[PDB]
């Protein structure tokens, strides 16, 4: 069956919209996904169908907040982070993570079937 509801990441919306802009308006705009006025109606339909199936995951908003913090550091950008056990575990691992990963992979490769 087809159990998965389709998703479309923002990048696809922007790419499609810029393709349509180049094809119908004679000039691309650049990383804007709200300007849809000159395109024909059968394109507004597609844009609506896309943007109503959009899926923005936590990764995108977190990267956005990160670049934000990096932009305005001390205008209230200083944040507190929850100390959920994953966060404390990462605080612990961070110093010597790569050695941990290399060691795990070495043991794995030694334990592969052949």
């Amino acid at each position: 069956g087809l159990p998965w509801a389709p998703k479309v990441r923002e990048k696809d919306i922007e790419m499609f919209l810029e393709s349509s802009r180049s094809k119908f308006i004679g000039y691309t705009l650049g990383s804007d996904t709200n300007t849809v006025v000159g395109l024909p109606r059968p394109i507004h339909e597609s844009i609506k169908t896309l943007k109503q199936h959009k899926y923005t995951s936590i990764a995108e908003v977190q990267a956005q907040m990160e670049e934000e913090y990096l932009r305005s550091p001390l205008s209230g950008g200083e944040e507190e982070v929850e100390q959920v056990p994953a966060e404390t575990l990462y605080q612990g691992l961070l110093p010597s993570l790569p050695q941990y990963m290399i060691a795990l992979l070495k043991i794995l490769l030694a334990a592969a079937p052949t």
Binding site: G1, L2, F16, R41, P42, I43, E45, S46, T49, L50
Partner: protein, 293 residues
């Protein structure tokens, strides 16, 4: 400004009903109006309860007249034409002119879908170009009609549960949202979802396959079954390949093929067929034979 061109269109349709074509200027203004009308139609159109679906026509204008005689006149009966209007027939120009004239006049009572033979390449090869030239001594017509074909909706959806489309369905397509999310304002690309909707066809081999036609695929039964279930459709109707009976039930009542051009392949000598969706979405077929010449 409004009833005047309505009367003009009615006169055009009446003239067309006698195998009498139009002047290239008339065709130009007609194609402009038809572009204006078609631009307000999604890639997957919705049609209300009672309709009469007809498939491959292929320029057999006198057989289109016979069809109209069988299933009723233009405004009285709602029609739905699934593509392949113009090639492999002598009266291609008249056929497409009549269908477009209807669509412009009664924009609610008739719906025409794009077909494999609506791309500039296939027409230029198979003959519509030649008839355009012979009957007009130009390509201005064949330019207008192709720039119009680039607007025809790809699919139709009757009562939200019948899926009608020339050709068949594609792997790059999983739900009607996907089709509705395409860009149909271009010539048919050589590979894409468009070059499969208008080129694929069912078959016996389950799952996808390679189409001996050269474009699109050959969706087996399981593909159609899961597509129907995942979209709530009760039946997918199509018309792309000759069926001597007039209409075939492929994939266990999931897919119907309705050829509507009689005596198309003369070695076979098929009989055309059309489907009627009555007030209660119950389909009933009418099979007819070529007109008396």
């Amino acid at each position: 400004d409004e009833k005047v061109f309505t009367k003009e269109l009615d006169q055009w349709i009446e003239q067309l009903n006698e195998c009498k074509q139009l002047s290239e200027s008339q065709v130009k203004s007609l194609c402009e109006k038809a572009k204006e009308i078609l631009t307000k139609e999604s890639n997957v159109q919705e049609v209300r309860c009672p309709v009469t679906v007809c498939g491959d026509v292929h320029g057999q204008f006198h057989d289109l007249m016979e069809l109209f005689r069988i299933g009723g006149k233009s405004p009285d009966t709602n029609y739905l034409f699934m593509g392949d209007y113009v090639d492999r027939g002598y009266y291609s120009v008249e056929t497409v002119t009549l269908l477009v004239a209807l669509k412009v006049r009664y924009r609610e009572r008739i719906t025409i879908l794009r077909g494999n033979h609506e791309s500039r390449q296939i027409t230029q090869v198979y003959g519509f170009y030649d008839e355009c030239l012979r009957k007009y001594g130009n390509a201005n017509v064949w330019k207008y009609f192709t720039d119009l074909f680039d607007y025809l909706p790809l699919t139709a959806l009757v009562d939200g549960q019948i899926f009608c489309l020339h050709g068949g369905l594609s792997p790059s397509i999983d739900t009607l949202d996907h089709i509705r999310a395409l860009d149909r304002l271009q010539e048919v690309p050589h590979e894409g979802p468009m070059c499969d909707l208008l080129w694929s066809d069912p078959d016996d081999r389950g799952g996808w396959g390679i189409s001996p036609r050269g474009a699109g695929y050959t969706f087996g039964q399981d593909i159609s079954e899961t597509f129907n279930h995942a979209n709530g459709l009760t039946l997918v109707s199509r018309a792309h390949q000759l069926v001597m009976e007039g209409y075939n039930w492929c994939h266990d009542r999931n897919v119907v093929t309705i050829f509507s051009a009689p005596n198309y392949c003369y070695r076979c000598g098929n009989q055309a067929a059309i489907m009627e969706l009555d007030d209660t979405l119950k389909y009933s077929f009418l099979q007819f034979d070529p007109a008396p010449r």
